[PDB]
Design a binder for this molecule. Structure first.
Ligand code: CDL
Ligand code: PC1
Ligand code: PC1
Ligand code: PTY
Ligand code: PTY
Ligand code: HEC
Ligand code: HEM
Ligand code: HEM
Ligand code: LMT
Lengths: 124, 383, 244, 71, 85, 56, 54
């Protein structure tokens, strides 16, 4: 699934009051049980990157964001191999779990999807 | 420049076993690949040795296996090693496939090593099936009979193909001699495909338990994974030892110590344990051709995992719902295994059908739904 | 399936050879051979065992040669190409009671007594099944069982009706070692002997297994030390990050 | 004599007495049912195999070790 | 998607200092007892439900099915078996 | 210290030693399958008459 | 310890020679040890134990 898909569907849910009332609390619990924050990751660090689109989005990250992501990946790899969890400031607090990458990938995909559409245009 | 890099031949070995850059966080489930290579080497050594003492002619086959047991120096060991390692080969291959499914090893960019992997699995099944026939005991003969008759389901030409495979009108000497020749060949074919799936993997490298890139943090294959592989090699050899020396017949069927008799049918004709889930799936469909299709589809459906998994994240480490679904899928696969060896009786008939539906609905319904929902939960949950 | 169709499952008897470190009792093996020779051999062959196989297990070279030399085997034809017999040698296989299946079945009301060389491996239960079967003929079949003609009731046998009658009765054999030959004793001895016949490598296999277990365990322990030693620089790695 | 004769008898009267009774009752019923006419043209003929198995399984559990101890 | 040593395909790394000590300078089994007890307990506790729930469910299913099957092939189960077939 | 290194080489050496002894046992037992099997060794004796054989 | 290291461990040629010589000794002694132990735990049961009667 494309990030675009996930973002659009999420926006449909967040619009509907009923839907958000039942989905948002579930999503927050899901995230708590997921436990990626306990390895000091941000959600966006987990997104599959071995794709042309994602490689382009990562190249467009600001250098600071890019350097910090490299560190979080290396740090999490060290926790993984040691069978430890993050403690203290290494734990990602909910307020630090920012979607730093989502804007970049949404722009990359916007162009890619428009290109596919326009490759199929029919002069009327 | 170091010789290991300069010389083209040495460099190929170097690229796979020494300088090969690995993730630094592979867990013990990444050790089944080398255990599978170990099983393959043991099977080649013991298999070629048994071939020096075995006679493929139906008048002598069963007796040649007894001669191996009784007269050949350490023949008992070589025979039991070969027979038990066939079981261990399947334990390791199921573990390896289990690892791959849990950690999303089938996702891009590793679709090709996974798809070649599915073929390796089919080749192992055929290899092991043909090897079992070679003993020419009661289970050998009757197993061959019923499995080869599944080909009769192919429309129009089905029966003709069966007689072609047998080289006669029933399983007999021609079938045994051809199964010997093909059993000898198939492990070499299998080794080639095993090499192909590694070469295909080398473009992306190994995945890792976190499902993120390891390009940031690599370790040489040697010495780290060399020495880590030794632990599981010795754990494997301990398990091997307990079966081969202390309980060599635990995984076998007593009926295979009775010489093949085309007249007498054994009480229950069951495949070897590792084929039992596929046999349960076949029984579930009442139609002959239906059953065969289902049974083959149960393996070929693995090829669609890259498509039906809709997750933006690789693997299950961080996906609580996917982990629960995976648990149910694996346990259902074991229940299918058990149901493959019960009698066709109430209430196991309907149970087998329910378990078969669950097996397929994992690929076709549940994984696509669950992976879609988890995508949304990750996004909303972290806003 | 009904329990009758399966057969009653035999008790787990404490055989001397049960036990990772236990061999067969060779005195029982010798006594079991004597039961085979005097009772079973009337109807059952032991075709996979040669006289040489007894030597240094149950008998000395001389005793086994004496057994072989009492029999006549087919020799190579003489100079006019006529058939000849010779006395047996240690290389010869123990000869069976019948020339073919048809003769065997004719002598046993249609039933074919199996060869006993692999019977301990060819039946679920092994020695326990052999012992249970031989000692488990009730005096009277359970009320309601209809036996087919030529059949005997035995609950251990699947279906209950076996073509072999009870054959072990107190004192059918006189053991050469003075052991009281009760039904139970003879069944135990012959079951042991037949288990040996099915798996004669048993004793050597378990001793080599002991050696393997010890070596492999030590290697496993050392491999854990060596892995931990080599991996410690990776496990112990620490980072300081100063964001650029 | 066969040590098993006495051990089996002891186990039947002792720890396996409930099973012994059931087998006995069953045999009584079946013999009586066979005694009655037009038994041969009945649909269901009861046996006592089940009860026999329960008794034998019980006797074997209480005897196996004791028997092999005296051989 | 993977290069080789020197050009692995990592985004540029800067600002991380890594430190470690020699295998000969380290105690390989330092803190082994604490790990073996407390670390294993934590890791196991956190995964327990994902094993227990499916195993227990499928064991219950099997137990019920096998007990019914056994009962159907007794004398008592004659009638229910006749209907089932 | 030399004592410190020597200990770890003792572990490595022991491991090499058991691997050497285990490989030797494995190779010897396994290859022995190719030596004459028990039945081959059983063939050993032949009696011949001499009365029939003419001079020269 | 220095002495031991310098003689048996420092040169790999010496280390491998020492390992192989140790393997030879281990192989011979372990054989003998297991033989005796096996004979004690299986006493009176083996052919060698009853052979004298015949
Ligand atoms: C066959 C031939 C023999 C060779 C043996 C090779 C098998 C080795 C292997 O792959 O498994 C070892 C493996 C230890 O491997 P590891 O690299 O330390 O951690 C791998 C897990 O991803 C790490 O998982 P984790 O860190 O979340 O720890 C979970 C684990 C605890 O794992 C520990 O060992 C601690 O405990 C359980 O899941 C137990 C379930 C609770 C039952 C009650 O054991 C498991 O963790 C098995 C869990 C499977 C369920
Ligand atoms: C039986 C059911 C097993 C369900 C496993 C659920 C996850 C779990 O608890 O496992 C522990 C571990 C959990 O490991 P993990 O990598 O998810 O978590 C490590 C720790 N954290 C989360 C902090 C990063 O899972 C494994 O190691 C799973 C390997 C799967 C192998 C299955 C073989 C089955 C063969 C059938 C073939 C068809
Ligand atoms: C299987 C064959 C086992 C053969 C053992 C013979 C000695 C080799 C050995 O154990 O490794 C020592 C040697 C060296 O181990 P090492 O590399 O730890 O020793 C080098 C450092 N010194 C010499 C100072 C101790 O291994 C090899 O040379 C490779 C052979 C592998 C076996
Ligand atoms: C069964 C086989 C086990 C016997 C071989 C193990 C090695 C014996 C001791 C020798 C040793 O430890 O020295 C290292 C040799 O290991 C090596 O060079 C090999 C390391 C591990 C041995 C086998 C690797 C297994 C990995 C994959 C398993 C495949 C199974 C499929 C068949 C070199 O030590 P160093 O090189 O670290 O440097 C150190 C400085 N010289
Ligand atoms: C092929 C299957 C490989 C698995 C090996 C398991 C043991 C097989 C050997 C037979 C055996 O039982 O050896 C015992 C010792 O155990 C041992 O010491 C053997 C255990 C060692 C396990 C790993 C070592 C190498 C295995 C593979 C390497 C192959 C390359 C060279 C052949 C008995 O000892 P004995 O008295 O029979 O011995 C003769 C010299 N005393
Ligand atoms: C005079 C006949 C006769 C004697 C004596 C005899 N048997 Fe048998 N035995 C048979 C026949 C006939 C069968 C086949 C029964 C059947 O298949 O219904 C048989 C079957 C068996 C079976 C296999 C039952 C099965 O599971 O298929 C074993 C084991 C056996 N005998 C062992 C022995 C032993 C041990 C002895 C004596 C110490 C013995 N027999 C003495 C005639 C004999
Ligand atoms: C003879 C059988 C096989 C052998 C010897 C073998 C060997 C290996 C080895 C050595 C690796 C790299 C190390 C590892 O991850 O364990 C590996 C990886 C892999 N194998 Fe296999 N394999 C075999 C069968 C299979 C099968 C049946 C499949 C799939 C159905 C498969 C799919 C894969 C995949 C996808 C990977 C990459 C996993 C990853 O690192 O993320 N293999 N295999
Ligand atoms: C993937 C590799 C292999 C597998 C999984 C495999 C599996 C098997 C199995 C299951 C049997 C039946 C064993 C028994 O119950 O007795 C068998 C028998 C046999 N295999 Fe293989 N085998 C493999 C490779 C080979 C090779 C390379 C040879 C070389 C000829 C070979 C030769 C034999 C022979 C001669 C027998 C019959 C003798 C016997 O039953 O032991 N095998 N094999
Ligand atoms: C695993 C069994 C061990 C035997 C190895 C398998 C034999 C077949 C391997 C050859 C197949 C070709 O495999 C290919 O080889 C070359 C060089 O060897 C590797 O090339 C890699 O290493 C070399 C230097 O080590 C670099 O120049 C290059 O940048 C890098 O990609 C490829 O990553 C690998 O895919």
């Amino acid at each position: 699934a494309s990030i675009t898909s996930v973002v659009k569907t999420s926006e449909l849910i967040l619009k509907s009051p009923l839907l958000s009332k039942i989905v948002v609390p579930l999503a927050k619990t899901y995230v708590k049980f997921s436990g990626y924050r306990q390895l000091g990751f941000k959600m966006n660090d987990l997104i599959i990157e071995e794709t042309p689109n994602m490689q382009l989005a990562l190249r467009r990250l600001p250098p600071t964001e890019s350097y910090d992501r490299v560190y979080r990946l290396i740090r999490a790899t060290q926790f993984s191999l040691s069978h430890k969890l993050a403690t203290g400031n290494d734990i990602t607090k909910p307020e630090e779990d920012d979607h730093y990458l989502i804007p970049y990938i949404l722009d990359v995909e916007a162009e890619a999807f428009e290109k596919d559409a326009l490759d199929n245009l029919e002069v009327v | 420049m170091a010789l290991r890099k300069k010389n083209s031949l040495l460099n190929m070995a170097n690229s796979y076993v020494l300088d090969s850059p690995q993730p630094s966080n592979l867990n013990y489930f990444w050790n089944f690949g080398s255990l599978l290579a170990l099983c393959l080497v043991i099977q080649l050594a013991t298999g070629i040795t048994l071939a020096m003492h075995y006679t493929s002619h139906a008048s002598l086959a069963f007796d040649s296996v007894e001669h191996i047991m009784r007269d050949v120096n350490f023949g008992w060991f070589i025979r039991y090693a070969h027979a038990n390692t066939a079981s261990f080969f399947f334990i390791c291959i199921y573990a390896h496939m289990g690892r791959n499914i849990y950690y999303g090893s089938y996702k891009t960019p590793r679709v090709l090593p996974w798809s070649i992997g599915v073929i390796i699995f089919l080749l192992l099944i055929i290899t092991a099936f043909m090897g079992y026939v070679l003993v020419f005991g009661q289970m050998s003969l009757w197993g061959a009979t019923v499995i080869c008759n599944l080909v009769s389901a192919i429309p129009w030409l089905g029966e003709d193909i069966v007689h072609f495979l047998w080289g006669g009108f029933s399983v007999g000497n021609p079938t045994l001699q051809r199964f010997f020749a093909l059993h000898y060949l198939m492990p070499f074919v299998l080794a080639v495909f095993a090499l192909l799936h590694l070469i295909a993997l080398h473009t992306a490298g190994s995945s890792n338990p976190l499902g993120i890139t390891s390009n940031v943090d690599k370790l040489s294959m040697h010495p780290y994974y060399s020495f880590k592989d030794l632990i599981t090699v010795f754990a494997f050899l301990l398990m091997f030892t307990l079966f081969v020396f202390f309980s060599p017949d635990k995984l076998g069927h007593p009926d295979n110590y009775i010489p093949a008799n085309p007249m007498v049918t054994p009480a229950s004709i069951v495949p070897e344990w590792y084929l039992l889930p596929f046999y349960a799936i076949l029984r579930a469909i009442p139609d002959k051709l239906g059953g065969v299709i289902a049974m083959v589809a149960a393996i070929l459906i693995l090829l669609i995992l890259p498509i039906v998994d809709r997750s933006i994240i690789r693997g299950n480490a961080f996906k609580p719902i996917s982990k629960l679904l995976f648990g149910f899928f694996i346990c259902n696969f074991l229940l299918l295994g058990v149901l493959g060896q019960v009698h066709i009786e109430p209430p196991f008939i309907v149970l087998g059908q329910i378990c078969t539906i669950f097996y397929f609905s994992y690929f076709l319904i549940l994984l696509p739904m669950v992976s879609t929902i988890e995508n949304i939960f990750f996004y909303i949950g972290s806003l | 399936m009904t329990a009758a169709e399966h057969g009653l499952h035999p008790a787990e008897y404490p055989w001397p050879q049960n036990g990772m470190l236990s061999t067969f009792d060779h005195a029982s093996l010798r006594r079991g051979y004597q039961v085979y020779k005097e009772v079973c051999a009337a109807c059952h062959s032991l075709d996979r065992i040669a006289w040489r196989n007894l030597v240094g297990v149950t008998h000395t070279t001389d005793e086994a040669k004496a057994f072989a030399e009492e029999l006549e085997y087919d020799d190579e034809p003489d100079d006019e190409g006529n058939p000849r017999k010779r006395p047996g040698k240690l290389a010869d296989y123990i000869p069976g009671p019948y020339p073919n299946e048809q003769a065997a079945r004719a002598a046993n009301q249609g039933a074919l007594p199996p060869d006993l060389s692999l019977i301990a491996k060819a039946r679920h239960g092994g020695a326990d099944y052999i012992f249970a079967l031989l000692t488990g003929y009730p005096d009277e079949p359970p009320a309601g069982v209809v036996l087919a003609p030529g059949m005997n009731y035995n609950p251990y046998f699947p279906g209950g009706g076996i073509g072999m009658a009870r054959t072990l009765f107190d004192g059918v054999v006189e053991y050469e070692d003075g052991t009281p030959a009760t039904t139970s004793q003879m069944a135990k001895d012959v079951a042991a002997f037949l288990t040996w016949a099915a798996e004669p490598e048993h004793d050597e296999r378990k001793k080599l297994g002991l050696k393997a277990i010890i070596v492999i365990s030590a290697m496993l322990g050392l491999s854990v030390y060596i892995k931990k030693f080599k991996w410690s620089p990776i496990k112990n790695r620490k980072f300081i990050y100063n964001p650029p | 004599p066969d040590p098993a004769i006495a051990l089996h008898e002891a186990a039947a009267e002792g720890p396996c007495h409930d099973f012994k009774h059931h087998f006995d009752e069953c045999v009584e019923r079946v013999t009586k049912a066979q005694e009655a006419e037009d038994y041969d043209h009945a649909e269901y003929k009861e046996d006592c195999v089940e009860e026999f198995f329960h008794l034998q399984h019980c006797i074997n559990d209480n005897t196996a070790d004791k028997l092999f101890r005296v051989l | 998607y993977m290069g080789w040593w020197g050009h692995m395909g990592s985004p540029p790394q800067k600002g991380i200092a890594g430190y470690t000590i020699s295998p000969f300078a380290a105690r390989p089994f330092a803190g082994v007892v604490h790990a073996a007890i407390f670390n294993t307990f934590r890791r196991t506790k956190n995964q327990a439900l994902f094993v227990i729930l499916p195993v227990s469910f499928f064991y219950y299913v099997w137990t019920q099915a096998s007990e019914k099957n056994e009962w159907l092939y007794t004398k008592a189960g004659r009638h229910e078996l006749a209907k089932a077939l | 210290t030399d004592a410190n290194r020597l200990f770890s080489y003792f572990m490595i050496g022991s491991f090499g030693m058991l691997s050497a002894a285990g490989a030797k046992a494995t190779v010897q037992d396994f290859l022995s399958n190719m030596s004459a099997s028990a039945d081959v060794l059983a063939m050993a004796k032949v009696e011949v008459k001499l009365g029939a054989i003419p001079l020269g | 310890a220095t002495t031991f290291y310098n003689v048996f461990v420092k040169r790999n040629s010496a280390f491998v020679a020492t390992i192989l010589a140790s393997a030879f000794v281990f192989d011979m002694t372990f054989e003998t040890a297991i033989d005796n132990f096996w004979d004690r735990i299986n006493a009176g049961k083996q052919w060698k134990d009853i052979r004298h009667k015949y």
